[PDB]
Each structure stands twice: as structure tokens, then as C-alpha cells.
């Protein structure tokens, strides 16, 4: 098949086509990801065709539970919808079925070079990142980004919306809360506000909501709203979306929707632009040979840091 | 020579660390290498003084705040610098050839303490995105804050106050102390809603003199806490090699952004990104073909 019929299967809904795309878009191979390129610029007047809407979250929190509330809610009312994991540690499908979601966990191939500035997580960025036009493509039109690590930037990146789980430990101690994720939240949802810890979650919410309104500059364009959500019960599932569609309007009416994305999409250009220089030099024989002792060196002051960057430098002979 | 000079700074020769500081601030790359020779000599004095910063908004109080800090400091015979980025008064500098001044910054850190300043403070100057270049030059970073009301902030800019050590609400003097205070409490109940360091929330008035010896107490105390737990060498050692990278990391992006061929394609490439005539991966290999690397 031409990378024309493969874009017409995948639009049409073709049993074997995005399973196909997808195993394109992982692969490693110099003709794969040339035809990857070509398959996704075949796409491009699809790109952006769905919401893009990431959720993150501690483990435990009720990700999962949320997920599937939220998945089933929007299926009831129409929606195609799929779940994207970003899973560079590799812990991590049923395409066909209108009745459910697409649950994907995309990776490149076992004959890909990780990364010294990135690690998996690149490869897997990537690969999610292009995987969202093979969804929208296929009449996929909301696409859900989730964490599965220092994964949540990369996810905030790649969507519109950047949803924020937490939970009340009590009225007043919020719980699985990592340094520098809340200021990335355009909600944030106190989840498991059920049975007696209802209250407890509501209290805790208006304190945080506090805390924002104590950091925020009062006259900014969207002050994030703080939820409170039992996805067990379906409380508050509803209203989470309703507050998902009212961003995505108040960025719209804003002039900074569309903006917003493609700024993303120059950024990321930058991003692998930067990481393959940097993996160049890393990975580079002379620096591999000479880095430990270079640390070394530094670190027990036997060499400045200008000169040993100077020393790694020339070693690389990235000319 | 560069063994003469390491001894004329370390005697307190008038002259000597002025040259000493243009050497290290010389683009060009003879004068570099000279610099590296002495930075070398004088490492056995690397890492005498505390380091310690200080950011915030334009006219949050932060020049009169490093004055009282500095006259408390040499009143109990500090001797003390102050890097924007007579051991009777407070030495005051801002070198420069935001790279390029962090570089420069660090580098006469050392200069100081070869020459028996044993606190140094380094201060953001002005608007930018240089806080994160400054705490990690340092072993503690102070954020000074204002309160708009006992229920507003103002100054906050995204991404700042995880880097802080310890939080301050200056100008709590006059009928605005007891707003100055309310506001502290509810940003320290902030913090507790969301260890082996909690940052302390302070209120103080620079212009004066309370709260200010606290501030200091409450810096060393962060010290202690470090040494305590066998981390503050090793952060410092840490921040070397990081920096190290970053000088590394810094160089290859400039080779390739400062290429003529980027300089030529950029434009026109971005655009079709933006308008979809183009995908990122494509465009990001178009950009590396045209850097020649
Ligand atoms: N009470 C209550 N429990 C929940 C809720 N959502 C999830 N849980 C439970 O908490 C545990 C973790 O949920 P899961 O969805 O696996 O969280 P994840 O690890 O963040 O995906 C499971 O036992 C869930 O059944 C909720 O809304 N209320
Ligand atoms: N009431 C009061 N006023 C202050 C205090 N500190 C500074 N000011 C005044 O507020 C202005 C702030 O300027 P400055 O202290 O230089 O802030 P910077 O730009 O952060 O250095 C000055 O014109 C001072 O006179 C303080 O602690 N209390
Ligand atoms: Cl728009």
C-alpha cells in the first residue's frame, strides 16, 4: 500500500489500518520513519481535529476510575473517544468497539537508542505526539492524555486542557502533590468526595481555591477552578467536562486556542532539534571515554567546570 | 603572573582583584585561558563563603532589604559582597563579559572568597527568567514578596516560589504590618495544604530593621539543616558538574542556532510548521541538515 491508501484506510476505518500506522509512527527503521513523515503530512488536515485534554494524578488517586467515568460519560453523548499513556518506564488494544474507549500506550521499538538528555521519555513523547493525528484521522474527537515520573510537562505540552487529580488526606492536607505540577493545572479536581470524606474533600478544595486566589494575579484570563469529583459515584463527572468545554471557550474567545497549539508544535520542533544535538554530543565515543573522570575532576576541584565542558567539547568533535 | 596575582588577591592588594575580575570577564580567548589557570590556583578557596540569594520584584524592597542584611552582617565582622546577576562597607558588584553573566558571576564568586569575603549574596537584577540561574549558584534562596492586602500577594511569577528556601514579606511597618502578617500566615497554611526543609514564611521591614537579623538566623539555620544531613557539600558539588553540562548543553544549541544555514531556513520553516505545510519531525531534521554539523 501507498502512504495515500493507508490514509484513506485509516479515515475509512479499516480493520488493519491504524494498528499499522501505529507500528509505522514506533518504528526505528530510516524507511518507516520517512513514511511515517509522509503519512502524517497526508494527515495534516486532520491534525487537531479532537480535544486535547491531559490528566495527571499520584497512583492511587483514582486516574484510572476517573478515566473510565469521564470515557463512558462522553461516549453516552456521542463522542469517539481514546486514552493515550505516556509510560517511558514501559508498564503499560481494542480499537473497534464505539461502545468503549481506545485505551493505547504507544513506544518505539526495541531497536531504538534512548536518550542521555531524555531517556525513554522522548521516544515515547514523540510517538504519543503523532499518534494523537492517527486518532483524529480514524474520527477520534476527544483525545485524553494520561501520566503514568517527570512525565506531566510532556503531557501539559501536547493538550489544550491539563487536568490536575489530587486528594484530601483531611480538610486541610492535600496528598501526592509533586513540586511544580500544580502550576502547570488548568483544574484542579479533589477526587473520592464520597460517603463521610465528601465534606472533607469540599474543605479542602475551597483552601486550595484560597491558595490560588492568594497566588494568582486577580485579573488573569483563567483562574483555575477547583472540583470536587467522586468518579466511583459519577458526582461531579459531568461538571468536570462542562469546565473542560468552558476553557476551551474562554481560550477561543481569547484568540489563543489555536495559538496555543501551534506554539506547542514549533516548541516541540525545537525540543528535538536540541535533543538530538545534546545526544550527539553525549553519546559521542570521546565523551563517553572521558566523562567520569572529567566529574571526577570537578568535583574534587582538580578542574574548573569551564574547562572540563571545554575538554568535553572537544571530545565530541561535533563539528 | 597568574601564580603572583593568586597571592596579591589573597594578601588584599588593591589592585589585584579588579584585574582579576576583567580577566575573567575578557571575551577574548587568550585572557580565558589565564582565567581557568587562576581559578585553578585559587580552588583551595572555593566554597568559603555562604552563598546565598536573593529575588523579587522591582520594588519589592529588595536594595534596601541586601543593605540591612549587609551593615548586620559587617557590624559582626563579615566581610560581605553582593553579585547582581574598606571592610567597613559592603562590596557591591555586577560583572558581565544571561549565560554569559552566570558564568561570569560564578567564577568571581571565587575571586571574593580567594579574597576573604565570607558571605556573598547574589541578587536577580531586574525582569527575566534568570531565577533559576541563580539558585543554582547558591545554598540558600530567599523570595521577597509584598502583600497587596492580608488576602493578596503580588509578584509571584509562575515557577519562582518552588525554588524558595525562604519566603519574606517585606514592608511590614506602619498600619500595613498587620496585613503584612495575615498574608504571611495564609501563604504558610498555603504550603502546608500542599520534609527535610519546610520554607519558612517571614514578615520584615527593610527600611527599619525588624525582622531582619530573623531572616539571617533562619538562612543559617537552612545551612545547618544541609550540613546536618550531609547535603550541602554534596548540592554544591552537584551544582558544579550540572553546570558543567549546561555550559555544554549551552555551546552545541548556539553552534546550531547561530548556523548560517538556521539563520537562513528559520523563518520560512516555523511558518509551515505553524500553518501545517510542514511537520515538527521534518522541520526539526531540515534544521539540523542546514546547521552542517
Ligand atoms: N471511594 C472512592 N474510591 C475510589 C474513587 N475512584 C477510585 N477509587 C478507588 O481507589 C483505588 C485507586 O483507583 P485507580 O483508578 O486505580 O487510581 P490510579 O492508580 O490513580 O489509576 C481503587 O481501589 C479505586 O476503586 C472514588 O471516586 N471514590
Ligand atoms: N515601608 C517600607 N518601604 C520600603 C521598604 N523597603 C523599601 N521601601 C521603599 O520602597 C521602594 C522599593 O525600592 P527597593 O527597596 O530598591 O526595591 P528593589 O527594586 O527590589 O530594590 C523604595 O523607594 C523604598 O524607599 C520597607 O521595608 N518598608
Ligand atoms: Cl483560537
Do not use: C
Not at 521499538?109 to 525513554?120: C, E, F, I, K, L
Not at 480514524?138 to 503531557?155: I, K, M, P, R, Y
Amino acid at each position: 500500500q501507498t502512504v495515500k491508501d493507508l490514509a484513506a484506510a485509516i479515515r475509512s476505518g479499516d480493520r488493519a489500518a491504524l494498528p499499522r500506522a501505529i507500528t509505522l509512527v514506533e518504528s526505528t527503521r530510516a524507511d518507516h520513519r520517512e513514511r511515517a513523515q509522509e503519512l502524517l503530512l497526508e494527515l495534516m488536515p486532520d491534525a487537531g481535529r479532537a480535544m486535547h485534554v491531559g490528566i495527571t494524578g499520584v497512583p492511587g488517586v483514582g486516574k484510572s476510575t476517573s478515566i473510565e467515568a469521564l470515557g463512558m460519560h462522553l461516549i453516552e453523548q456521542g463522542h469517539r473517544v481514546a486514552v493515550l499513556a505516556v509510560d517511558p518506564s514501559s508498564v503499560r488494544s481494542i480499537l473497534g468497539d464505539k461502545t468503549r474507549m481506545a485505551r493505547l500506550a504507544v513506544h518505539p521499538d526495541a531497536y531504538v537508542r534512548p536518550s542521555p538528555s531524555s531517556g525513554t521519555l522522548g521516544g515515547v513523547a514523540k510517538a504519543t505526539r503523532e499518534t494523537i493525528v492517527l486518532l483524529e484521522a480514524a474520527g477520534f474527537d476527544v483525545v485524553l492524555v494520561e501520566t503514568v515520573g517527570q512525565s506531566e510537562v510532556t503531557v501539559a505540552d501536547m493538550v489544550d486542557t491539563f487536568v490536575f487529580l489530587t486528594l484530601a488526606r483531611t480538610g486541610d492536607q492535600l496528598q501526592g502533590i509533586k513540586k511544580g505540577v500544580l502550576e502547570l493545572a488548568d483544574i484542579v479536581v479533589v477526587n473520592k468526595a464520597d460517603g463521610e470524606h465528601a465534606v472533607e474533600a469540599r474543605k479542602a478544595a475551597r483552601e486550595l481555591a484560597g491558595a490560588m486566589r492568594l497566588i494568582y494575579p486577580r485579573e488573569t484570563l483563567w483562574r483555575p477552578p477547583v472540583l470536587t469529583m467522586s468518579a466511583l459515584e459519577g458526582t461531579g463527572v459531568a461538571e468536570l467536562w462542562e469546565t473542560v468545554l468552558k476553557h476551551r471557550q474562554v481560550l477561543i474567545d481569547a484568540g489563543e486556542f489555536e495559538k496555543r497549539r501551534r506554539d506547542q508544535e514549533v516548541n516541540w520542533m525545537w525540543t528535538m532539534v536540541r535533543d538530538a544535538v545534546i545526544d550527539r554530543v553525549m553519546t559521542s565515543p570521546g565523551v563517553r571515554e572521558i566523562r567520569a573522570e572529567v566529574e571526577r575532576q570537578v568535583r574534587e576541584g582538580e578542574l574548573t567546570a569551564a574547562l572540563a565542558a571545554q575538554r568535553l567539547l572537544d571530545a565530541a568533535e561535533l563539528r
